[PDB]
Amino acid sequence: QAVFSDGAVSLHTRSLKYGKLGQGVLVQVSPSLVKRQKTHFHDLPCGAS
RNA sequence: UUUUUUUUUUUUUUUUUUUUUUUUUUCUCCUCUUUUUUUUUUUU
């Protein structure tokens, strides 16, 4: 949502695609291998998202 | 003879801890010559 005065970040969930997630797996990598785009949500035609 | 409207200095604070100088090496190593050893004694 906005940037605080000491580098803190406030985040909001004011939409329909945002909120608590369900089942799946999580993979954590360095935050420099992700390419900037305009659609970070994907529905890959393989059987998963 | 030139009207009307365009917000602004991050929210939070009432957290526990039962130790003690230093600290850790260096090897074996030819001693030259008048001697037995003098000696009581007294004046401090």
Short mmCIF file of N, CA and C (backbone and C1' of nucleotides) in Angstrom, two decimals:
data_model
loop_
_atom_site.label_atom_id
_atom_site.label_comp_id
_atom_site.label_asym_id
_atom_site.label_seq_id
_atom_site.Cartn_x
_atom_site.Cartn_y
_atom_site.Cartn_z
N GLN A 1 0.82 -1.21 0.00
CA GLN A 1 0.00 0.00 0.00
C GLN A 1 0.85 1.27 0.00
N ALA A 2 1.76 1.40 0.97
CA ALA A 2 2.54 2.63 1.10
C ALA A 2 3.85 2.32 1.81
N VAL A 3 4.75 3.30 1.79
CA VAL A 3 6.08 3.20 2.38
C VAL A 3 6.10 4.05 3.64
N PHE A 4 6.56 3.46 4.74
CA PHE A 4 6.64 4.18 6.01
C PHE A 4 7.90 5.04 6.03
N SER A 5 8.22 5.61 7.19
CA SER A 5 9.33 6.54 7.33
C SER A 5 10.63 5.86 7.76
N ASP A 6 10.61 4.54 7.98
CA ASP A 6 11.80 3.80 8.37
C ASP A 6 11.96 2.53 7.54
N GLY A 7 11.55 2.59 6.27
CA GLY A 7 11.67 1.45 5.38
C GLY A 7 10.64 0.36 5.58
N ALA A 8 9.67 0.56 6.46
CA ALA A 8 8.63 -0.44 6.65
C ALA A 8 7.59 -0.33 5.54
N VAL A 9 6.89 -1.44 5.31
CA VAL A 9 5.90 -1.52 4.24
C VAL A 9 4.57 -1.95 4.84
N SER A 10 3.50 -1.28 4.43
CA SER A 10 2.14 -1.66 4.77
C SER A 10 1.46 -2.25 3.54
N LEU A 11 0.86 -3.42 3.69
CA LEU A 11 0.28 -4.16 2.58
C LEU A 11 -1.20 -4.39 2.84
N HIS A 12 -1.99 -4.35 1.76
CA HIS A 12 -3.44 -4.43 1.84
C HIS A 12 -3.95 -5.59 1.00
N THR A 13 -5.20 -5.98 1.27
CA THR A 13 -5.84 -7.13 0.63
C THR A 13 -7.22 -6.73 0.12
N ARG A 14 -7.29 -5.58 -0.54
CA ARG A 14 -8.57 -5.02 -1.00
C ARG A 14 -8.84 -5.40 -2.46
N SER A 15 -9.01 -6.70 -2.69
CA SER A 15 -9.40 -7.19 -4.01
C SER A 15 -10.04 -8.56 -3.84
N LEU A 16 -10.25 -9.25 -4.97
CA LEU A 16 -10.83 -10.59 -4.97
C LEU A 16 -9.80 -11.69 -5.18
N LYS A 17 -8.69 -11.38 -5.85
CA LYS A 17 -7.63 -12.36 -6.07
C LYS A 17 -6.68 -12.47 -4.89
N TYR A 18 -6.76 -11.56 -3.92
CA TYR A 18 -5.88 -11.56 -2.77
C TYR A 18 -6.60 -12.16 -1.56
N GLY A 19 -5.81 -12.68 -0.64
CA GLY A 19 -6.32 -13.24 0.59
C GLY A 19 -5.55 -14.48 0.97
N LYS A 20 -6.07 -15.17 1.99
CA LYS A 20 -5.43 -16.39 2.48
C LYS A 20 -5.41 -17.46 1.40
N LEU A 21 -4.27 -18.14 1.28
CA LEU A 21 -4.06 -19.17 0.28
C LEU A 21 -4.36 -20.55 0.87
N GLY A 22 -4.43 -21.54 -0.02
CA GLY A 22 -4.78 -22.88 0.40
C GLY A 22 -3.65 -23.88 0.27
N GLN A 23 -3.93 -25.01 -0.38
CA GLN A 23 -2.96 -26.08 -0.51
C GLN A 23 -1.95 -25.77 -1.61
N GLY A 24 -0.80 -26.42 -1.54
CA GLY A 24 0.24 -26.25 -2.52
C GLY A 24 1.61 -26.35 -1.87
N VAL A 25 2.62 -25.94 -2.63
CA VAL A 25 4.01 -25.94 -2.17
C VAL A 25 4.60 -24.56 -2.37
N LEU A 26 5.59 -24.23 -1.55
CA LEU A 26 6.25 -22.93 -1.57
C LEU A 26 7.74 -23.11 -1.84
N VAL A 27 8.28 -22.25 -2.70
CA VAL A 27 9.70 -22.26 -3.04
C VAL A 27 10.23 -20.84 -2.87
N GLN A 28 11.25 -20.68 -2.03
CA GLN A 28 11.85 -19.38 -1.76
C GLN A 28 13.19 -19.26 -2.47
N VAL A 29 13.37 -18.19 -3.24
CA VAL A 29 14.59 -17.93 -3.97
C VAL A 29 15.04 -16.50 -3.67
N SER A 30 16.17 -16.11 -4.24
CA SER A 30 16.64 -14.74 -4.07
C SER A 30 15.70 -13.78 -4.81
N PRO A 31 15.43 -12.59 -4.25
CA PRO A 31 14.55 -11.63 -4.93
C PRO A 31 15.23 -10.80 -6.01
N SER A 32 15.98 -11.46 -6.89
CA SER A 32 16.56 -10.79 -8.04
C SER A 32 16.47 -11.61 -9.32
N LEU A 33 15.83 -12.78 -9.28
CA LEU A 33 15.67 -13.63 -10.45
C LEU A 33 14.27 -13.57 -11.04
N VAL A 34 13.43 -12.65 -10.58
CA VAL A 34 12.06 -12.51 -11.07
C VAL A 34 11.99 -11.30 -11.99
N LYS A 35 11.48 -11.51 -13.19
CA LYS A 35 11.43 -10.48 -14.22
C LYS A 35 10.19 -9.62 -14.03
N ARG A 36 10.37 -8.30 -14.04
CA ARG A 36 9.25 -7.40 -13.89
C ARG A 36 8.32 -7.51 -15.09
N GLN A 37 7.02 -7.49 -14.82
CA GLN A 37 6.00 -7.66 -15.85
C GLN A 37 4.76 -6.86 -15.43
N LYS A 38 3.64 -7.12 -16.10
CA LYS A 38 2.37 -6.55 -15.72
C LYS A 38 1.35 -7.58 -15.25
N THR A 39 1.62 -8.87 -15.44
CA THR A 39 0.73 -9.93 -14.95
C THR A 39 1.58 -10.95 -14.20
N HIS A 40 1.58 -10.89 -12.88
CA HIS A 40 2.31 -11.85 -12.06
C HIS A 40 1.48 -13.06 -11.68
N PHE A 41 0.21 -13.09 -12.08
CA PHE A 41 -0.67 -14.23 -11.88
C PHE A 41 -0.72 -15.04 -13.17
N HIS A 42 -0.54 -16.35 -13.06
CA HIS A 42 -0.49 -17.20 -14.24
C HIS A 42 -1.34 -18.45 -14.03
N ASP A 43 -1.79 -19.01 -15.15
CA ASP A 43 -2.69 -20.16 -15.20
C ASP A 43 -2.19 -21.18 -16.21
N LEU A 44 -0.88 -21.48 -16.15
CA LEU A 44 -0.15 -22.29 -17.11
C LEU A 44 -0.94 -23.52 -17.55
N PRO A 45 -1.00 -23.79 -18.86
CA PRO A 45 -1.78 -24.91 -19.40
C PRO A 45 -1.11 -26.27 -19.20
N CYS A 46 -0.85 -26.61 -17.95
CA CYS A 46 -0.22 -27.88 -17.59
C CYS A 46 -1.04 -28.69 -16.60
N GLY A 47 -1.82 -28.04 -15.74
CA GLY A 47 -2.60 -28.71 -14.72
C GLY A 47 -2.45 -28.05 -13.37
N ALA A 48 -1.70 -26.96 -13.33
CA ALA A 48 -1.46 -26.22 -12.10
C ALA A 48 -1.32 -24.74 -12.43
N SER A 49 -1.20 -23.92 -11.39
CA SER A 49 -1.03 -22.48 -11.52
C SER A 49 0.23 -22.07 -10.77
P U B 1 -16.09 47.75 -19.24
"O5'" U B 1 -15.96 46.80 -17.97
"C5'" U B 1 -14.73 46.16 -17.64
"C4'" U B 1 -14.87 44.66 -17.62
"C3'" U B 1 -13.55 43.89 -17.65
"O3'" U B 1 -13.72 42.66 -16.94
"C1'" U B 1 -14.82 43.35 -19.57
P U B 2 -12.45 41.94 -16.26
"O5'" U B 2 -12.47 40.47 -16.87
"C5'" U B 2 -13.42 39.51 -16.44
"C4'" U B 2 -12.79 38.17 -16.15
"C3'" U B 2 -11.68 38.18 -15.10
"O3'" U B 2 -11.71 36.94 -14.39
"C1'" U B 2 -10.82 37.39 -17.15
P U B 3 -11.87 36.94 -12.79
"O5'" U B 3 -13.40 36.55 -12.56
"C5'" U B 3 -13.85 36.00 -11.34
"C4'" U B 3 -14.93 34.97 -11.57
"C3'" U B 3 -14.77 33.67 -10.81
"O3'" U B 3 -15.28 33.74 -9.49
"C1'" U B 3 -15.34 33.24 -13.09
P U B 4 -14.74 32.75 -8.34
"O5'" U B 4 -15.04 31.29 -8.90
"C5'" U B 4 -16.33 30.70 -8.76
"C4'" U B 4 -16.27 29.20 -8.85
"C3'" U B 4 -15.14 28.53 -8.07
"O3'" U B 4 -15.51 28.24 -6.73
"C1'" U B 4 -15.12 27.76 -10.32
P U B 5 -14.59 27.33 -5.78
"O5'" U B 5 -14.84 25.83 -6.27
"C5'" U B 5 -14.53 24.72 -5.44
"C4'" U B 5 -13.67 23.70 -6.15
"C3'" U B 5 -12.26 23.51 -5.61
"O3'" U B 5 -12.21 22.62 -4.51
"C1'" U B 5 -12.21 23.70 -7.98
P U B 6 -11.06 22.78 -3.40
"O5'" U B 6 -9.93 21.76 -3.84
"C5'" U B 6 -10.25 20.42 -4.21
"C4'" U B 6 -9.19 19.83 -5.11
"C3'" U B 6 -7.74 20.02 -4.68
"O3'" U B 6 -7.32 19.10 -3.69
"C1'" U B 6 -7.97 20.43 -7.01
P U B 7 -6.17 19.52 -2.65
"O5'" U B 7 -6.56 18.75 -1.31
"C5'" U B 7 -7.60 19.22 -0.46
"C4'" U B 7 -7.55 18.55 0.89
"C3'" U B 7 -6.16 18.30 1.45
"O3'" U B 7 -5.55 19.42 2.05
"C1'" U B 7 -7.49 16.36 1.70
P U B 8 -3.97 19.63 1.91
"O5'" U B 8 -3.37 18.65 3.02
"C5'" U B 8 -3.81 18.74 4.37
"C4'" U B 8 -3.06 17.79 5.29
"C3'" U B 8 -1.54 17.80 5.14
"O3'" U B 8 -0.87 17.85 6.42
"C1'" U B 8 -2.39 15.59 4.81
P U B 9 -1.01 16.72 7.58
"O5'" U B 9 -0.15 15.49 7.04
"C5'" U B 9 0.48 14.59 7.94
"C4'" U B 9 1.97 14.58 7.75
"C3'" U B 9 2.76 13.65 8.66
"O3'" U B 9 2.76 12.31 8.21
"C1'" U B 9 3.79 15.78 8.62
P U B 10 2.45 11.11 9.24
"O5'" U B 10 2.49 9.80 8.33
"C5'" U B 10 3.58 8.90 8.41
"C4'" U B 10 3.17 7.57 8.98
"C3'" U B 10 2.66 7.58 10.42
"O3'" U B 10 1.31 7.98 10.52
"C1'" U B 10 4.20 5.79 10.11
P U B 11 0.67 8.32 11.95
"O5'" U B 11 0.14 6.91 12.49
"C5'" U B 11 0.49 6.45 13.79
"C4'" U B 11 -0.03 5.05 14.03
"C3'" U B 11 0.52 4.33 15.25
"O3'" U B 11 -0.11 4.71 16.46
"C1'" U B 11 0.57 2.88 13.38
P U B 12 0.77 5.11 17.74
"O5'" U B 12 1.33 3.72 18.27
"C5'" U B 12 0.46 2.75 18.84
"C4'" U B 12 1.19 1.46 19.13
"C3'" U B 12 2.45 1.57 19.98
"O3'" U B 12 2.19 1.63 21.37
"C1'" U B 12 2.90 0.25 18.07
P U B 13 2.49 2.97 22.19
"O5'" U B 13 3.20 2.46 23.53
"C5'" U B 13 2.62 1.43 24.31
"C4'" U B 13 3.53 0.23 24.41
"C3'" U B 13 4.87 0.46 25.10
"O3'" U B 13 4.78 0.43 26.52
"C1'" U B 13 5.23 -0.70 23.08
P U B 14 5.88 1.18 27.42
"O5'" U B 14 6.22 0.12 28.56
"C5'" U B 14 6.44 -1.25 28.25
"C4'" U B 14 5.94 -2.15 29.35
"C3'" U B 14 5.69 -3.60 28.96
"O3'" U B 14 6.87 -4.38 28.94
"C1'" U B 14 3.87 -2.78 30.24
P U B 15 7.02 -5.60 27.90
"O5'" U B 15 7.55 -6.80 28.80
"C5'" U B 15 8.85 -6.76 29.37
"C4'" U B 15 9.76 -7.79 28.76
"C3'" U B 15 11.14 -7.91 29.39
"O3'" U B 15 11.14 -8.70 30.56
"C1'" U B 15 11.35 -7.81 27.04
P U B 16 12.31 -8.54 31.65
"O5'" U B 16 12.92 -10.01 31.77
"C5'" U B 16 12.17 -11.06 32.35
"C4'" U B 16 12.78 -12.40 32.05
"C3'" U B 16 14.30 -12.48 32.12
"O3'" U B 16 14.79 -12.61 33.44
"C1'" U B 16 13.55 -13.50 30.13
P U B 17 16.07 -11.77 33.92
"O5'" U B 17 17.30 -12.72 33.58
"C5'" U B 17 17.25 -14.10 33.91
"C4'" U B 17 18.11 -14.92 32.97
"C3'" U B 17 19.61 -14.67 33.05
"O3'" U B 17 20.23 -15.37 34.12
"C1'" U B 17 18.93 -14.65 30.79
P U B 18 20.83 -14.56 35.37
"O5'" U B 18 22.39 -14.87 35.30
"C5'" U B 18 22.86 -16.12 34.81
"C4'" U B 18 22.96 -17.15 35.91
"C3'" U B 18 23.71 -18.42 35.55
"O3'" U B 18 25.11 -18.28 35.64
"C1'" U B 18 21.67 -18.98 36.60
P U B 19 26.05 -18.68 34.40
"O5'" U B 19 27.44 -19.05 35.07
"C5'" U B 19 28.51 -19.61 34.30
"C4'" U B 19 29.49 -18.55 33.87
"C3'" U B 19 30.88 -18.67 34.48
"O3'" U B 19 31.84 -18.18 33.54
"C1'" U B 19 29.95 -16.60 35.10
P U B 20 33.41 -18.46 33.76
"O5'" U B 20 34.01 -17.02 34.09
"C5'" U B 20 35.28 -16.62 33.57
"C4'" U B 20 36.25 -16.27 34.68
"C3'" U B 20 36.64 -17.43 35.59
"O3'" U B 20 37.97 -17.23 36.06
"C1'" U B 20 35.61 -15.73 36.87
P U B 21 39.24 -17.66 35.18
"O5'" U B 21 40.37 -16.64 35.63
"C5'" U B 21 40.11 -15.24 35.73
"C4'" U B 21 41.38 -14.44 35.82
"C3'" U B 21 42.39 -14.69 34.71
"O3'" U B 21 42.14 -13.91 33.56
"C1'" U B 21 43.47 -14.86 36.81
P U B 22 42.64 -14.42 32.11
"O5'" U B 22 44.22 -14.36 32.22
"C5'" U B 22 45.05 -15.03 31.27
"C4'" U B 22 46.21 -15.72 31.94
"C3'" U B 22 46.89 -16.79 31.10
"O3'" U B 22 48.30 -16.80 31.34
"C1'" U B 22 46.03 -17.76 33.09
P U B 23 49.31 -17.31 30.19
"O5'" U B 23 49.07 -18.88 30.14
"C5'" U B 23 48.98 -19.58 28.90
"C4'" U B 23 48.00 -20.73 28.98
"C3'" U B 23 47.72 -21.44 27.66
"O3'" U B 23 47.32 -22.80 27.90
"C1'" U B 23 45.73 -20.46 28.44
P U B 24 48.15 -23.83 28.83
"O5'" U B 24 49.38 -24.26 27.92
"C5'" U B 24 50.54 -23.44 27.80
"C4'" U B 24 51.40 -23.88 26.65
"C3'" U B 24 52.16 -22.76 25.95
"O3'" U B 24 53.41 -23.26 25.49
"C1'" U B 24 50.70 -23.81 24.41
P U B 25 54.77 -22.81 26.20
"O5'" U B 25 55.70 -24.10 26.07
"C5'" U B 25 57.11 -23.98 25.96
"C4'" U B 25 57.75 -25.33 25.75
"C3'" U B 25 59.18 -25.29 25.21
"O3'" U B 25 59.93 -26.36 25.78
"C1'" U B 25 57.79 -26.46 23.69
P U B 26 60.88 -26.08 27.05
"O5'" U B 26 62.35 -26.08 26.46
"C5'" U B 26 62.69 -25.26 25.35
"C4'" U B 26 63.68 -25.95 24.44
"C3'" U B 26 64.88 -25.10 24.02
"O3'" U B 26 66.04 -25.93 23.94
"C1'" U B 26 63.71 -25.84 22.10
P C B 27 67.00 -26.08 25.22
"O5'" C B 27 67.55 -27.57 25.11
"C5'" C B 27 66.66 -28.68 25.09
"C4'" C B 27 67.36 -29.92 24.59
"C3'" C B 27 68.63 -30.29 25.33
"O3'" C B 27 68.40 -31.01 26.53
"C1'" C B 27 69.06 -30.30 23.01
P U B 28 69.53 -31.03 27.67
"O5'" U B 28 70.53 -32.18 27.22
"C5'" U B 28 71.76 -32.37 27.89
"C4'" U B 28 72.79 -32.99 26.97
"C3'" U B 28 74.24 -32.75 27.34
"O3'" U B 28 74.71 -33.62 28.36
"C1'" U B 28 73.95 -32.26 25.06
P C B 29 75.84 -33.12 29.39
"O5'" C B 29 77.08 -32.75 28.46
"C5'" C B 29 78.02 -31.75 28.85
"C4'" C B 29 78.41 -30.87 27.69
"C3'" C B 29 79.56 -29.89 27.97
"O3'" C B 29 80.32 -29.73 26.77
"C1'" C B 29 77.63 -28.68 27.33
P C B 30 81.68 -30.56 26.55
"O5'" C B 30 82.77 -29.77 27.39
"C5'" C B 30 84.14 -30.15 27.34
"C4'" C B 30 84.73 -30.40 28.71
"C3'" C B 30 84.79 -29.18 29.62
"O3'" C B 30 84.63 -29.59 30.98
"C1'" C B 30 86.98 -29.99 29.25
P U B 31 83.91 -28.63 32.04
"O5'" U B 31 85.10 -27.71 32.60
"C5'" U B 31 84.84 -26.65 33.51
"C4'" U B 31 85.98 -25.66 33.56
"C3'" U B 31 87.30 -26.21 34.08
"O3'" U B 31 88.39 -25.56 33.41
"C1'" U B 31 86.58 -24.46 35.48
P C B 32 89.72 -26.39 33.08
"O5'" C B 32 90.90 -25.32 33.22
"C5'" C B 32 91.43 -24.97 34.49
"C4'" C B 32 92.84 -25.48 34.66
"C3'" C B 32 93.63 -24.91 35.83
"O3'" C B 32 93.30 -25.51 37.07
"C1'" C B 32 94.97 -24.87 33.89
P U B 33 93.80 -24.84 38.44
"O5'" U B 33 95.26 -25.46 38.66
"C5'" U B 33 96.41 -24.63 38.77
"C4'" U B 33 97.59 -25.38 39.33
"C3'" U B 33 98.85 -24.53 39.57
"O3'" U B 33 99.56 -25.06 40.69
"C1'" U B 33 99.34 -26.25 38.03
P U B 34 100.53 -24.12 41.55
"O5'" U B 34 101.95 -24.84 41.48
"C5'" U B 34 103.10 -24.20 42.01
"C4'" U B 34 103.73 -25.02 43.10
"C3'" U B 34 102.80 -25.96 43.87
"O3'" U B 34 102.61 -27.19 43.19
"C1'" U B 34 104.08 -24.71 45.41
P U B 35 101.26 -28.04 43.40
"O5'" U B 35 100.61 -27.43 44.73
"C5'" U B 35 99.59 -28.13 45.42
"C4'" U B 35 100.15 -28.84 46.63
"C3'" U B 35 99.16 -29.12 47.76
"O3'" U B 35 98.38 -30.28 47.53
"C1'" U B 35 101.14 -28.18 48.66
P U B 36 97.03 -30.52 48.37
"O5'" U B 36 97.52 -31.12 49.76
"C5'" U B 36 98.18 -32.37 49.83
"C4'" U B 36 98.92 -32.54 51.13
"C3'" U B 36 98.08 -32.53 52.39
"O3'" U B 36 97.45 -33.77 52.66
"C1'" U B 36 99.97 -31.14 52.68
P U B 37 96.12 -33.80 53.55
"O5'" U B 37 95.61 -32.29 53.52
"C5'" U B 37 95.25 -31.61 54.72
"C4'" U B 37 95.97 -30.29 54.83
"C3'" U B 37 95.50 -29.39 55.97
"O3'" U B 37 96.60 -28.61 56.44
"C1'" U B 37 95.14 -28.30 53.91
P U B 38 97.24 -28.89 57.88
"O5'" U B 38 97.53 -27.44 58.45
"C5'" U B 38 98.76 -26.79 58.18
"C4'" U B 38 98.68 -25.30 58.39
"C3'" U B 38 98.36 -24.83 59.80
"O3'" U B 38 99.47 -24.90 60.68
"C1'" U B 38 97.04 -23.63 58.23
P U B 39 99.77 -23.80 61.82
"O5'" U B 39 98.37 -23.48 62.50
"C5'" U B 39 98.05 -22.15 62.92
"C4'" U B 39 96.61 -22.03 63.32
"C3'" U B 39 96.32 -22.41 64.77
"O3'" U B 39 95.21 -21.67 65.28
"C1'" U B 39 95.16 -23.87 63.32
P U B 40 95.43 -20.53 66.38
"O5'" U B 40 96.10 -21.33 67.59
"C5'" U B 40 95.35 -22.24 68.39
"C4'" U B 40 95.96 -22.37 69.76
"C3'" U B 40 96.22 -21.06 70.48
"O3'" U B 40 95.08 -20.61 71.20
"C1'" U B 40 98.16 -22.44 70.57
P U B 41 94.42 -19.19 70.89
"O5'" U B 41 94.88 -18.26 72.10
"C5'" U B 41 95.76 -18.73 73.10
"C4'" U B 41 96.94 -17.81 73.28
"C3'" U B 41 96.80 -16.42 72.66
"O3'" U B 41 96.16 -15.49 73.51
"C1'" U B 41 98.90 -17.38 72.06
P U B 42 94.56 -15.43 73.62
"O5'" U B 42 94.27 -14.12 74.47
"C5'" U B 42 95.15 -13.73 75.51
"C4'" U B 42 95.94 -12.50 75.13
"C3'" U B 42 95.25 -11.53 74.17
"O3'" U B 42 94.34 -10.66 74.80
"C1'" U B 42 97.48 -11.93 73.45
P U B 43 92.83 -10.56 74.29
"O5'" U B 43 92.55 -8.99 74.23
"C5'" U B 43 93.16 -8.12 75.16
"C4'" U B 43 94.07 -7.13 74.47
"C3'" U B 43 93.51 -6.43 73.24
"O3'" U B 43 92.63 -5.36 73.55
"C1'" U B 43 95.72 -7.15 72.82
P U B 44 91.06 -5.63 73.77
"O5'" U B 44 90.36 -4.58 72.80
"C5'" U B 44 89.01 -4.19 72.99
"C4'" U B 44 88.12 -4.70 71.88
"C3'" U B 44 87.89 -6.20 71.86
"O3'" U B 44 86.90 -6.62 72.78
"C1'" U B 44 88.43 -5.46 69.69
#
